[PDB]
Amino acid sequence: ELTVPPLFSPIRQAIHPKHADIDVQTAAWAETFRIGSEELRGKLVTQDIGTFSARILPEGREEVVSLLADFILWLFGVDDGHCEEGELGHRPGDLAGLLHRLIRVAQNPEAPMMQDDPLAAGLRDLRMRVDRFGTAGQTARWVDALREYFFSVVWEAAHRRAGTVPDLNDYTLMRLYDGATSVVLPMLEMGHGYELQPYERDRTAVRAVAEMASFIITWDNDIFSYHKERRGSGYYLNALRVLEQERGLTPAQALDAAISQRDRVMCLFTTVSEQLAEQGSPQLRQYLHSLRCFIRGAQDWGISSVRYTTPDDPANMPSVFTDVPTDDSTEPLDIPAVSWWWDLLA
Numbered sequence: 419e420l421t422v423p424p425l426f427s428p429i430r431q432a433i434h435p436k437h438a439d440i441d442v443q444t445a446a447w448a449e450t451f452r453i454g455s456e457e458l459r460g461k462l463v464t465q466d467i468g469t470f471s472a473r474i475l476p477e478g479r480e481e482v483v484s485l486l487a488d489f490i491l492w493l494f495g496v497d498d499g500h501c502e503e504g505e506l507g508h509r510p511g512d513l514a515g516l517l518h519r520l521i522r523v524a525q526n527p528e529a530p531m532m533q534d535d536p537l538a539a540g541l542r543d544l545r546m547r548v549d550r551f552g553t554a555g556q557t558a559r560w561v562d563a564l565r566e567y568f569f570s571v572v573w574e575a576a577h578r579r580a581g582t583v584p585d586l587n588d589y590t591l592m593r594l595y596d597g598a599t600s601v602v603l604p605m606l607e608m609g610h611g612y613e614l615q616p617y618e619r620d621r622t623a624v625r626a627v628a629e630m631a632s633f634i635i636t637w638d639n640d641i642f643s644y645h646k647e648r649r650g651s652g653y654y655l656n657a658l659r660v661l662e663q664e665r666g667l668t669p670a671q672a673l674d675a676a677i678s679q680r681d682r683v684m685c686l687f688t689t690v691s692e693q694l695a696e697q698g699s700p701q702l703r704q705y706l707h708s709l710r711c712f713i714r715g716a717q718d719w720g721i722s723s724v725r726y727t728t729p730d731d732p733a734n735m736p737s738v739f740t741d742v743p744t745d746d747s748t749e750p751l752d753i754p755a756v757s758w759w760w761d762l763l764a
């Protein structure tokens with residue numbers, strides 16, 4: 419049983435003032451569309467997902483904060499319900515089929531397929547609201563990000579089926595998408611009523627800082643969710659387990675290695691973000707601000723949600739974040755998939 423120390427975060431807390439209302443409405447949405455089994459849904463509605471969304475978009479439009487909250491709950495419906503606690507999570511092929519069908523539902527809610535499925539019904543509601551607050555381009559990017567996430571959990575499912583653990587490079591590539599962090603990004607834009615244009619959005623350096631945010635968010639989750647994940651009865655995967663296997667480390671040593679990794683990415687993220695903001699559009703400056711909100715929102719939620727603190731078997735969690743890193747170096751991570759990020763330092 420590991421003790422997680424306070425993690426470094428240079429980002430101040432913030433939350434949308436209607437967080438309480440949003441959390442209630444998300445629970446009601448889950449019931450209306452019957453998302454997940456009765457057992458899963460009963461857990462999900464207590465995990466403060468609305469509160470989490472409120473921290474991601476603290477000054478966002480209330481309707482989009484609610485959309486994002488509903489979407490996060492829906493994603494847990496897929497990720498818990500099928501991938502990690504369902505039969506399809508051991509069957510990559512069958513999972514691939516379900517997920518292709520769901521993509522089609524997102525693209526065309528009017529198509530007469532999966533008319534019986536609660537997840538499909540919820541997805542249709544989400545798509546119709548994306549249509550309200552998003553452009554055609556943002557809607558297509560949302561679908562593409564859903565496909566990214568889906569493809570990556572099919573890859574994760576192959577490891578669960580085989581009972582194997584990927585090496586660090588493969589895990590990093592998989593984890594950059596299997597946390598669904600990329601699907602949230604279009605809603606960051608919609609939350610503030612703007613569109614980040616392709617010439618900025620798809621610029622390598624801008625993709626890079628988005629990937630860094632994804633890395634920090636998923637590593638922070640790997641750290642804070644290690645307790646609930648390891649104590650489960652089934653297969654689990656996270657950075658600590660990968661580091662244990664690859665480097666022959668104890669869980670405690672793996673924790674320290676993972677903290678060092680996310681500390682260095684946090685430092686790089688702030689530096690490269692600052693560079694980009696100096697001569698970026700006003701829209702890019704807002705997008706970069708929202709990436710900070712997403713990173714910090716996930717941090718505050720990660721140490722407080724009953725999803726991670728698990729009251730029936732209390733996790734040893736920090737109560738605060740620190741303003742100084744443990745690893746301050748500019749040495750790149752020994753991970754080929756992301757070590758190029760450090761080339762962006764001007």
Ligand SMILES: CC(C)=CCC/C(C)=C/CC[C@H](C)CCOP(=O)(O)OP(=O)(O)O
Binds near residue numbers: 493596597601639716
């Ligand atoms: C990654 C994060 C904390 C928030 C991102 C916001 C978001 C889109 C959450 C949906 C859940 C996602 C699909 C899995 C996260 O990983 P995992 O399988 O480790 O989640 P679990 O640790 O909560 O079981």
Ligand SMILES: [Mg+2]
Binds near residue numbers: 497501502596
């Ligand atoms: Mg997962």
Ligand SMILES: [Mg+2]
Binds near residue numbers: 497498502
């Ligand atoms: Mg999970």
Ligand SMILES: [Mg+2]
Binds near residue numbers: 639656
């Ligand atoms: Mg986790």
